[PDB]
Design a protein around this ligand. Sequence first.
Ligand SMILES: [Mn+2]
Ligand SMILES: [Mn+2]
Length: 107
Amino acid sequence: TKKVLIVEDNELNMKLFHDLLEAQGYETLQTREGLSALSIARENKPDLILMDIQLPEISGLEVTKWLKEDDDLAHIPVVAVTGGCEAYISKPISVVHFLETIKRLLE
Ligand SMILES: [Mn+2]
Ligand SMILES: [Mn+2]
C-alpha cells in the first residue's frame, strides 16, 4: 500500500487531503508540525510527502531541506502545498489536479 505523509496545520485542509488520498486506496500519516514530519518520515518511511509550505511554526521549505539532507529521506518525493520539491499545488485545491500530481509521482 502506498503511504502518503500529510503535513498540514489546517484541520479542514488535512481532512480533505486525507479523505481524497484514502479514497484512492492510499494509507496516510498526518501531522500539523514540520518537525514531527521528519520523525514520522524516518519511523514510517512514507512513499510521498505532502508539505504545506505555510505552516505557522516553521517554513515548510526548511523542512524540505532537512528531508533532502537526510540520506534516508532524500529520495522521497515532496509535493508542496502553497527547493527540493518535485511538484506544487495551489489553493483553492483542484481535486483532480491534486490527485493527478500525486499519482504521477507515486504510481
Ligand atoms: Mn495550512
Ligand atoms: Mn485514515
